């Protein structure tokens, strides 16, 4: 499973790491990456997994590369949908973007996000159980999607399938038929949007420009795909990161139960701690990157997750403090490519944990349980069991 070492690669440089299937996984996933971090191991390492790659491990590194599209090209950006993979052009599909889930439109719909918060947690509240990563998390960004889109409630089974098929497939579709189908069912909705527009996402994107030109239907529906599945696997599993945390420490709980202005600072803390995306990027030339030969067409993973484990960005990387002065963190990416939904989905944890903590303020990991993490492109949990007494509870 390893591949030779390139001649262009120094053998001291060569730590191999399995993005996928890391040795420390056990431990806690952030833990079995943050093994990149020990005092042995160089800023740029080679691991001969996956092919062979390089991988930055410093927050430093991190950010440069990403700061520098120059060099680091995102035509490949996952180790083995618009506008992941693109700069005038970026810019404007970003622009776009942004008009329909930057902060303005994230502040209207904030209480649409807790009111479903709230329907979610009410109905699983009087039960004293749940796994609350298939039974909370799963279904709440989908729904927040499906207001944010103007698409009716009766669409999300089918939708969600699909979704769920682009990455975790049952074998029941490839991912291009599931891509496909994703397609199937947005072009006929922008068609319709684009000459009877609403104020949802869809319309307003369906009716945007590039290049002093319209959307195409193919710009269009590629967007409107992005938007959708860019906030699924991410929210479902960091909600997870951050519940098993609070189940798991009764003190950082009980800090925000006493406090909870103090929630949106917990929440950026949180964001660092149980960072959870790796990406990477393609070599577009021949580049000395900080002392060290890459080769145009190498592959460079660079893990978002380990700026803010750094040690060198926050003192005491591993500890839980909701009080930090400054949380440094690339957790929402960093560069051109900086995710488009970070303030959509700082709002969805916020509300998520507000409204949890105040109906659910005691609850612990089901006891015999040991959770589960799981490595890749986007780190997770594969089951979150969470007991409580519903006597403790605040009802609707
Ligand atoms: C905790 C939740 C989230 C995290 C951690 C996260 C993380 C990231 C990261 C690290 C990137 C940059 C990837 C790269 O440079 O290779 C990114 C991009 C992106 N994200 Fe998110 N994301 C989250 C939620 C969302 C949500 C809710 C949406 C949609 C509403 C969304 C939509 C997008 C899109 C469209 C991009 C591509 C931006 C571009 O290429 O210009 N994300 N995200």
Redesign the pocket.
Known sequence: NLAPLPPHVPEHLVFDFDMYNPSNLSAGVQEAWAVLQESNVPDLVWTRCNGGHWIATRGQLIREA?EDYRHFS?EC?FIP?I??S?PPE?RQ??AL?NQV?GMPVVDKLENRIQELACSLIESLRPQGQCNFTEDYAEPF?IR??ML?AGLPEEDIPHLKYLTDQMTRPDGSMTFAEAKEALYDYLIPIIEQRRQKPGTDAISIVANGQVNGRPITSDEAKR?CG???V??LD??VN?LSFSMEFLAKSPEHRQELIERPERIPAACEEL?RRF???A???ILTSDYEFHGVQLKKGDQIL?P?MLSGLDERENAAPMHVDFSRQKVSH?????????????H??RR??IVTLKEWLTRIPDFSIAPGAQIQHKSGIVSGVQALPLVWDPATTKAV
């Open positions: 990403y995102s950006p949908f506008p992941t693109m970026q599909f970003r973007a889930v960004p927040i999607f944010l967007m992005l938007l959708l860019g906030g991410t929210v960091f964001l960072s959870l995306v990406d990477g990027r660079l978002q690339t957790t929402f990416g960093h560069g051109s490519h900086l995710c488009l939904g970070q959509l989905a969805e944890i």
